[PDB]
């Protein structure tokens, strides 16, 4: 937690539907955008912490 890894994801078709509908995750909450609109919206850069 103190030193987390930051991975940059870009230049692709990022499908978040599998992660949204996956039951293996204990929680999946989105703040700035709707969780069901991730497959329609587009972002300049994505960083995975």
């Amino acid at each position: 937690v103190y030193a987390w890894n930051r991975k940059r994801i870009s230049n692709c078709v990022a499908d978040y539907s599998v992660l949204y509908n996956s039951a293996s995750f204990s929680t999946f909450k989105c703040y700035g955008v709707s969780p069901t609109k991730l497959n329609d919206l587009c972002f300049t850069n994505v960083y995975a912490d």
């Binding site: 949204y20 509908n21 039951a23 969780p35 069901t36």
Partner: protein
């Protein structure tokens, strides 16, 4: 904290103008249907 005032933030469609929605039906967020039971991907449509 006065929690008696409620508002709706979950609905699958935008309202027609001058409409009043009193639906208590649980909003379905995920692909799995919600048979009146809330939980994961099944949320109460009203927030206090």
């Amino acid at each position: 904290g006065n929690y008696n005032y409620l508002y709706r933030l979950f609905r699958k469609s935008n309202l027609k103008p001058f409409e009043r929605d009193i639906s208590t039906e649980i909003y379905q967020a995920g692909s799995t249907p919600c048979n009146g039971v809330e939980g994961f991907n099944c949320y109460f449509p009203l927030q206090s």
